Structure formats: C-alpha cells, structure tokens
Nucleic acid binder design. Structure first.
Ligand SMILES: [Zn+2]
Ligand SMILES: [Zn+2]
Ligand SMILES: [Zn+2]
Ligand SMILES: [Zn+2]
Lengths: 86, 86
DNA sequence: AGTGATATTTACCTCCAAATGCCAGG
DNA sequence: CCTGGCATTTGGAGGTAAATATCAC
C-alpha cells in the first residue's frame, strides 16, 4: 500500500500513505538537505526490493506521489513531536 | 430498577446515590430553594414509584436517609457550572 | 551509513458519568 | 407551579494518527 515501494503501509506520512522505510528515508533526505545522483537514465524502477538501489530515483518518487517537504519539522518545531495544536 | 429512594429505574449515581431522574430533580430543586417541607402525618410515609409525590417531606427525608449530599448542588459561585469539575 | 523497525510523544475523537438547565403536562 | 423527561456541558479514561528520536543490523 506504500505509494512508493508497494510495501506494507499503516498510516499517512507527510501527506501520503507510505511505508516505514520510505518515511525514514524522506525525513533524513529533507533534514540534511542531501543531494543524490542517478547513475542511470535519471529514471530507475523503484519497488519493494529495489528501493535501495538508486537513492535519487527513490526521492524523485517521494515528490511525485506528493510527500510534503514542509511537514518535516524545523525552525522552532525542531524536535517537537506528536500532533500539532489546531 | 435501582433507585435507592423510590425503586424505579436508575441511570447512574446522583449526589452520591444511584437514584432516579425524578429523585434527582426533586433533591436538586429543593436544595436550590432551601424550601422547608411539612408532613401532615407520622413522618413515616411510604415511598415508591406510584406514591413518591404524596408527601414531599418524607420523600426528602428518605433522600438524606440513603446518603444524598447537599454539598454537591452548586450554589454561590458554581451557579450553572455544568459537567464535571477539574 | 544509511536503513528500517521500534518506542515516545503529542492532541484530538468517541464514550461515558454526572453536573446544569429548559419546557410539556398534571 | 411542581414533576421528570430530555437537552446541553464538562473532563478523564482509552484508542488512534502521525510527528519524533533510538537504536540493532
Ligand atoms: Zn515504501
Ligand atoms: Zn536512478
Ligand atoms: Zn426515585
Ligand atoms: Zn409524610
């Protein structure tokens, strides 16, 4: 059900039904503002087993499915956990 | 039911006792007004669903007799404060 | 190193008890 | 005007969603 691997998902993460591996991958990439390189055509297949093959095409898929970078906490919300008051 | 006072169906505890909806209002409206009741007879009058309105004094007498509390009725400041308290 | 599972943290959402009030009838 | 059935509030137990940090491999 994970919108990127097809692996098992149990809840929405950053606005998309995602697995627990992509959730952790998306956060670290956005938190460290990391940059990747696709050694291939700039498009690599991403499924459960090959998700850890081209990190670039993986993150390219996280955006294409709509994971919002700004949900990854920062500023005076750095290290704040749980639901937000609203 | 379970009403300690008259024996009708009892929904939950009221002022310390598992009481009626009728005995709830009768106790509340009295302590609100602080009205004094008179029993024209022995001070022993029967109490059940069909005959609870016959003697007001005895109905209130039985209310204190089964442990209903005057302190729980809200007056002074909590006049109207609804629901449970912090 | 990253990866991914796991635990900690938050704040709503629904019951649910028990307080108040407000009328439709007797 | 007295009765009592119904409605409107409070807040705490208990569960859920979705942020985080914390590791073992
Ligand atoms: Zn996934
Ligand atoms: Zn690629
Ligand atoms: Zn009763
Ligand atoms: Zn009497």
């Amino acid at each position: 059900r994970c919108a990127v691997c097809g692996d098992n998902a149990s809840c929405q993460h950053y606005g998309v039904r995602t697995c627990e591996g992509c959730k952790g991958f998306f956060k670290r990439t956005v938190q460290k503002n990391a940059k990747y390189i696709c050694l291939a055509n700039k498009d690599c297949p991403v499924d459960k087993r090959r998700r850890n093959r081209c990190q670039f095409c993986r993150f390219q898929k996280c955006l294409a499915v709509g994971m919002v970078k700004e949900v990854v906490r920062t500023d005076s919300l750095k290290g704040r956990r749980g639901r937000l008051p609203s």
